[PDB]
Design a protein around this ligand. Sequence first.
Ligand SMILES: *[C@@H]1O[C@H](CO)[C@@H](O)[C@H](O)[C@H]1NC(C)=O
Lengths: 50, 32
Amino acid sequence: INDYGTHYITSGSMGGIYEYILVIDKAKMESLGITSRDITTCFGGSLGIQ
Amino acid sequence: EEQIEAFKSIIQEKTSNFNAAISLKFTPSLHG
Ligand SMILES: *[C@@H]1O[C@H](CO)[C@@H](O)[C@H](O)[C@H]1NC(C)=O
């Protein structure tokens, strides 16, 4: 079997073959995050006795 | 390709004021 093969040819075509493949993969991922916080406190007191 | 950016900004302020207006005047010779 190893010397003469597992199969033999019964018919077919003896022509040439041209197979072209153009595989293109593109990926893009973007993530933006902005956080800003402001606080303000203002307090005063006046007391006078005369 | 890789790209990253980070910005930070912090500002702090604290005012303070403290008046003191006190006067003494007395007259009943005697004077103050
Ligand atoms: C003094 O009093 C005024 C009026 O109440 C106030 O605006 C000021 O902040 C006080 N303190 C100062 C001038 O240091």
